[PDB]
Amino acid sequence: YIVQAVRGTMATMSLDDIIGMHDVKQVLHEAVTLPLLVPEFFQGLRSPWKAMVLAGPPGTGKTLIARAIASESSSTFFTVSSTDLSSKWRGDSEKIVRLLFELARFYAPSIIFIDQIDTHEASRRVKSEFLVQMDRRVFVLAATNIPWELDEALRRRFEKRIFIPLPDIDARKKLIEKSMEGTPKSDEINYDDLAARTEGFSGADVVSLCRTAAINVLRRYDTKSLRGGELTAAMESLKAELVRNIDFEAALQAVSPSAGPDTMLKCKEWCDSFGAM
Amino acid sequence: YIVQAVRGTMATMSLDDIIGMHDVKQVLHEAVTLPLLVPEFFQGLRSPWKAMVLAGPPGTGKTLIARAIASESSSTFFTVSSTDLSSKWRGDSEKIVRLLFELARFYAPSIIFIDQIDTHEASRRVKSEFLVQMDRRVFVLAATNIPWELDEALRRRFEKRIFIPLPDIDARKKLIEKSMEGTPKSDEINYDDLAARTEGFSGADVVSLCRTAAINVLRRYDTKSLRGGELTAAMESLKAELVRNIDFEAALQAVSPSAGPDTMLKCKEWCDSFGAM
Amino acid sequence: YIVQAVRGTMATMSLDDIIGMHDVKQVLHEAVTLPLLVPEFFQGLRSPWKAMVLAGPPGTGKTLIARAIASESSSTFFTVSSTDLSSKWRGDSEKIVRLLFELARFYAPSIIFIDQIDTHEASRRVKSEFLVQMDRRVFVLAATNIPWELDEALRRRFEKRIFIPLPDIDARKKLIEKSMEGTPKSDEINYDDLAARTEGFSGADVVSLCRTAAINVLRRYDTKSLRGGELTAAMESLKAELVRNIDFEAALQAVSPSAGPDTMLKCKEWCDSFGAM
Amino acid sequence: YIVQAVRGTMATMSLDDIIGMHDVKQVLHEAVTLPLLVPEFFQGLRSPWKAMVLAGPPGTGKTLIARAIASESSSTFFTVSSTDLSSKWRGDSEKIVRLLFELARFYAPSIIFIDQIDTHEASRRVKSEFLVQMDRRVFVLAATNIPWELDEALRRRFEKRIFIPLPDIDARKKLIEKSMEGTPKSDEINYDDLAARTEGFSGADVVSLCRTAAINVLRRYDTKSLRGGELTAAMESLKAELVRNIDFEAALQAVSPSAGPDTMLKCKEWCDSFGAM
Amino acid sequence: YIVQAVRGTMATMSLDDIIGMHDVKQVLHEAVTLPLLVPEFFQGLRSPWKAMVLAGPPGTGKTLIARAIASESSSTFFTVSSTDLSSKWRGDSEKIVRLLFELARFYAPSIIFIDQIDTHEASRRVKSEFLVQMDRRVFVLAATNIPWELDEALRRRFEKRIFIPLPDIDARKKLIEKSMEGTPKSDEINYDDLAARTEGFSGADVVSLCRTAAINVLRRYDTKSLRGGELTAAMESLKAELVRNIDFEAALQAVSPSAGPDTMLKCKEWCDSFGAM
Amino acid sequence: YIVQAVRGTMATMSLDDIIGMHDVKQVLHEAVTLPLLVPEFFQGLRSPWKAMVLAGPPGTGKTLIARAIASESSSTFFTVSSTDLSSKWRGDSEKIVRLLFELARFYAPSIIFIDQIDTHEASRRVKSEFLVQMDRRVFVLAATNIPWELDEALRRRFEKRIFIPLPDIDARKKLIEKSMEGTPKSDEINYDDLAARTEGFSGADVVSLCRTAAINVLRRYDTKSLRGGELTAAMESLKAELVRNIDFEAALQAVSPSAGPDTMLKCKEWCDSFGAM
Ligand SMILES: Nc1ncnc2c1ncn2[C@@H]1O[C@H](COP(=O)(O)OP(=O)(O)OP(=O)(O)O)[C@@H](O)[C@H]1O
Ligand SMILES: Nc1ncnc2c1ncn2[C@@H]1O[C@H](COP(=O)(O)OP(=O)(O)OP(=O)(O)O)[C@@H](O)[C@H]1O
Ligand SMILES: Nc1ncnc2c1ncn2[C@@H]1O[C@H](COP(=O)(O)OP(=O)(O)OP(=O)(O)O)[C@@H](O)[C@H]1O
Ligand SMILES: Nc1ncnc2c1ncn2[C@@H]1O[C@H](COP(=O)(O)OP(=O)(O)OP(=O)(O)O)[C@@H](O)[C@H]1O
Ligand SMILES: Nc1ncnc2c1ncn2[C@@H]1O[C@H](COP(=O)(O)OP(=O)(O)OP(=O)(O)O)[C@@H](O)[C@H]1O
């Protein structure tokens, strides 16, 4: 009908690129890979969940893991907006979802994920609209970062509600090192040492840090002096040239955690209290 | 027309699945079935309650019963959407509800049920339009959990406004014992003491917590059997386990059931005063 | 064409089924019939009434008086919707709100009544359109429940603004005893003390209350006669057992008013202040 | 055609029936008739005002003078709708608003007036269409009570912005006495006490007030004579009786004018604030 | 065929009766006639201005200017509206336009102008159909007073977008004297003290002001004290009578500008910013 | 069908011709030279980027740098806009999108340069196809001028999104001297003091400035006092007359951009933050 925006969300790296949450990845592999192999278990009592609840700080791989599983997804995924923004003239944007579940059955093994459901009156209209259609073999999920704003029933509805804590300095060592895979770099780098200053970072913080040094190294030497737009040998030796703490040092001063840690403490106190598995 | 879109409203289990509510259960057993069976006395002042009110937290088997009635019902249901869409082409679907009730007399015995229908302009427009459509014999009902949002005249118009608290240890006894049916389950278990440890939960809590033990089967098994394709021990034996007190024991600390029921307490204060039977 | 929708809008008991409204029943008996029995006096300077104002709580005999006058009147009623639908092909039914009056002319004296006329642009458009078509002998009236929401010119335009007091003890008395018609009962019943019990209520309260004792005619019995098919001796003795004060004990403990007195009391403040008679 | 529907826009009591507004009635007497009697003075810069701007609390003799002048009107008025359908079939009902003035001049030096035409796309399409259509001798007019409805061009288009406040007291004297016309009445009246105690009201208030004591003439007499058809000596002597101050005591206490001067006062500023003479 | 509607769009006084916009008056002697007299200058860079844009506070002689223009313009004018009211029978209008620029070059380098061109898909239909037909050398222009609805593409293609504020007191003074033409008038006059009260007043206000003292002349006589409707010789003394500062005094105190300034201020800001010259 | 028409999309110029954004000259030495010469530095994280688009004014050499890169590029180029105005005869310019990728891989290292990016439903058939395909170092680029032209996430999809500054000065002098070609004018002209105070301007602005002084040719002389309908040899020597520096004086100071530079600052911050390089 008006499926421009509906057909728009028609949709088409590796899995354990991400490192952490043995319980989560476990329960998901279990929840997803197995019933294809073993439908006979997953039945009524035994049958799997098609979603849960989640939350975490932004830039913490919740959108990247979506690509990790879309990459895993030998099944089908359906893409997402937080904005089914009709007009006062159009006024109806959850019959959209009444066609969505037709897509879900159409691509019968079907996958969906959003962030920040917490996205007035028509809010209650469509937000309420999703609930009856919420309940053939399908998965979906969603997440936020302010489950303190857990509004109505999703402490009831959903079997698990994960707040993620940031990786520890040990992890962050292993995760820089997972981020530094295949990098020109001097051997002065003790990742345990530099990670002393990373405390408070997310994944992406460390990402754009290692990048910030990756282009520090570009901008160290006569980098303004082009060859007039041509190749010099040393310019190719940039790949040959290494990254260093001093090439991080600009990245060290440059990058900051720059976030509300007390928010994580708040929604972590939440994640124990009405915060499901 | 949207007439076939009105034909989108076209419809086409057991009772002891449900536990509790024996007053309501006989009230509805009676008020629904027996008018079929004694038209000679279900009449006049003895008219069938064509609707009444409802309340309580959701995920309380209201949708579950709402399906159980359907597979139970010897009448003509009609599929229901609160998303009677809002085009700037007709801008009127409570008219199409005039066509609905037309179907209701066409399918002279019939059933409908929606929920959370506390659902500016369009609200009073199409709602009050329906109220014009409000008043052979037919039954419909609806529900919500916000009698806080007891909008204008709904509470006054219905026979009984039914709040439900959480179940008790004996309700929870039979509810556990219903979830556990046909299950590989050990016999060392005091499901009544387990139910004693169910302080202030839902039915669905019992459901997905029995499931939490159901996965705890795997968690006790060699859950690292991620050989994949290679069937092995895991494929050979998922029926082997019998669930045990320890499965549920971990399942308990796994729980963060839901938020506080202080709003359920609130409308429970409403369910007495201004809340009918 | 869509005028045929008004051809669908064509329309084609006793006052002693009702209690009170002495002023109103007077003024309507009078203002309608007696000019129709005395065209000669009640005309010109003695112009008979064609409309006035109304409002109050619902379930207050507005529907009851509606269908009551329907089966009563010796004149030409026409059915009443709020569905002058809104096509974005024509989007103009106020012409049919003129052919309205053509029907008032073709049926020279006519009867119409709506309620809850809260019924953007198009609202004001067709509204003022009716203010044009508004202004031989005809009477029509309307009502709402929000004279607080008496929109712009309605209060000014009508003679009689109406406030419906809730019933008093003797109102309650005859309202019961009329509600207790066709009612094999016990004679312990003290309708006076019962009327004492039942303050803060309306007529529909007595309706559903008498019905509550009505189902209690069963539920006094061994209520679970689920033999089924077996014509239980109750099924012959249905009307046999009597109404008893126990049945209204169980009922009236089951009853809530579902009444917010402060709103009807609010427009009761209005019913003197900008509230005509 | 719809052009033939314009044939439905076709038209075919006096001033001193009305009281007050010596200023207005002067300007109208003058601006209408004296050009029609003196083409020689009234021309060029002495051109007659073919329309201007009007206000007042509605139902205060605006449509009433609109009729009374039509009885006076010794020229060619034709009837006036705000109802040209929003047909998505012919592109513009404003086409007939173009043939409008062809009908005017082809017919005669002509007369037009509407009320409450404060009156989306098609709205301003046809509106501006008339704004061109307006710009020999012809007269037109229009009114409202919407002070904010000087939408785009309206303040500029109409020369003088006319408003009528609520009456003063000697007004209420002469307006009683005009409302006391054709009235057998007791000479005990203190019209000064009447206009005094009846202050701040509309004309229509007084209309229904005289009708109120009028019906009161019965409501003292044997209203209870519900024989029906059986004549009463009053039923012949209905007009025989005179009305009394005691009757208008009832007619006082029974009513609230059902209007606040809030927006009446707002336009009582707008009549000065961007309100021409 | 129906294109004769454009044969009906055909059309066939002084020019310089205006005080203001002297730079524009230059521009419109200059892009206009001297092309018709010296194309040798006007071609290439020198070529005449193809078109531009206009707006301002309504009724400031802007809709009246074009009568002066075409009354003076020896070149050819054809009328304009927004009257492309097509039919679904036609399913199209802008074949008109293809025949319309052909109409232009068919007769001669011609004259065209609309007001309120701020005027579903049909807008895109006739607009996209137009804007190539937009482009032997000819001039056209348009105007509005709603630059809030101003375009980008026509803000793009157009050379200029002209605003006028209200006049100034000396222009206003010589516009009294322009409005005091053919006018019996006294010698106690102070045209700049007259113009002192022009706060908020534009030209048309002064037009109706001279007409307001003009009517004031009779308003000093007694009108409804008829001469039997006779042409009283005092009515020729009106031709003898002169108008006076006192005669305007009443109009000045009695009259508002009937307008709002800050919208003219709004587009006076847009005329500088994103409004071309 | 459109294969030979597509053979016109084929394409192939000094690059410091376009001046400023030398950081971007590094970007394009790193997007043209090095992804063709040395993608070994540009590996993994440093890997070549996919494509982007551009905010900025026009008159900014978007196609200048495009063709300059093109004939400079060891990669190929294509002549592309959004003006694939498809037909029923063509049927699918989305097959022309697929053919665009096909030619891109055919001339495997290639460049494509497009704007009119937001230039009906066909926009979304093609846009969706292109969005799906985009996934080698076959670099591509688009552009626009609307900063809010981020469609839904296609801005979010891109490598980067850049706003660009105003131009340098010696080409403002030189291109003054390009548009002033073949013009009568003085030799005193300080084209770098012309180009000095050009702050915030573009090309056609200054073309209209050339026309502006070219009419100042007259508007020093008197347009009102003609030669009496004659064409005095001065009136034709205006063609012979010299335009000069101070002939632009009012054309310099009074002429404004009429554009928003602080939204340019907004989206400039958007390419500083939340917009990549
Ligand atoms: N555990 C991890 N292992 C490796 N990389 C990680 C991990 N967590 C985060 N990252 C890196 O940080 C980036 C953050 O991506 P992503 O946007 O998915 O986080 P996010 O929380 O979903 O952000 P947002 O919630 O704002 O969308 C990832 O692309 C990834 O490269
Ligand atoms: N008394 C009960 N008997 C059986 N099952 C129950 C009971 N209470 C809750 N449940 C279980 O809880 C789950 C959710 O119940 P259900 O959705 O029907 O309640 P609800 O009020 O309709 O919730 P919602 O309206 O939010 O969907 C069901 O799977 C149901 O089996
Ligand atoms: N004066 C009365 N006499 C008899 N019955 C009454 C009276 N007033 C109220 N009732 C009872 O109240 C019940 C509901 O009244 P009714 O529906 O007519 O009021 P209402 O304003 O039309 O309500 P709604 O508009 O919400 O349907 C009826 O069954 C009627 O018997
Ligand atoms: N001075 C007066 N003389 C006579 N009648 C008056 C006077 N002032 C007010 N009225 C009364 O006002 C009443 C209604 O006025 P009218 O209907 O003309 O106004 P309206 O605003 O056009 O009404 P509506 O808003 O319903 O269209 C008339 O019955 C009339 O008698
Ligand atoms: N400077 C002026 N010189 C001459 N006449 C003027 C001047 N200013 C205003 N007027 C008068 O104002 C009247 C209304 O102006 P006009 O309708 O032409 O302008 P407009 O703003 O286009 O009006 P609209 O946009 O509402 O059609 C004209 O009759 C004109 O005589």
Swiss-Prot record, chains A, B, C, D, E, F:
Its EC number is 5.6.1.1. One of its GO terms (biological process) is female meiotic nuclear division. ATPase activity is stimulated by microtubules, which promote homooligomerization. ATP-dependent microtubule severing is stimulated by interaction with mei-2. One of its GO terms (cellular component) is meiotic spindle pole. The keyword Nucleotide-binding applies. Catalytic subunit of a complex which severs microtubules in an ATP-dependent manner. Microtubule severing may promote rapid reorganization of cellular microtubule arrays. Required specifically for meiotic spindle formation in the female germline; the presence of this protein is inimical to the formation of mitotic spindles. In body wall muscles, regulates organization of myosin thick filaments. This is Meiotic spindle formation protein mei-1. It comes from Caenorhabditis elegans. The gene is mei-1. The chain holds residues 173 to 472 of 472 of the full protein.
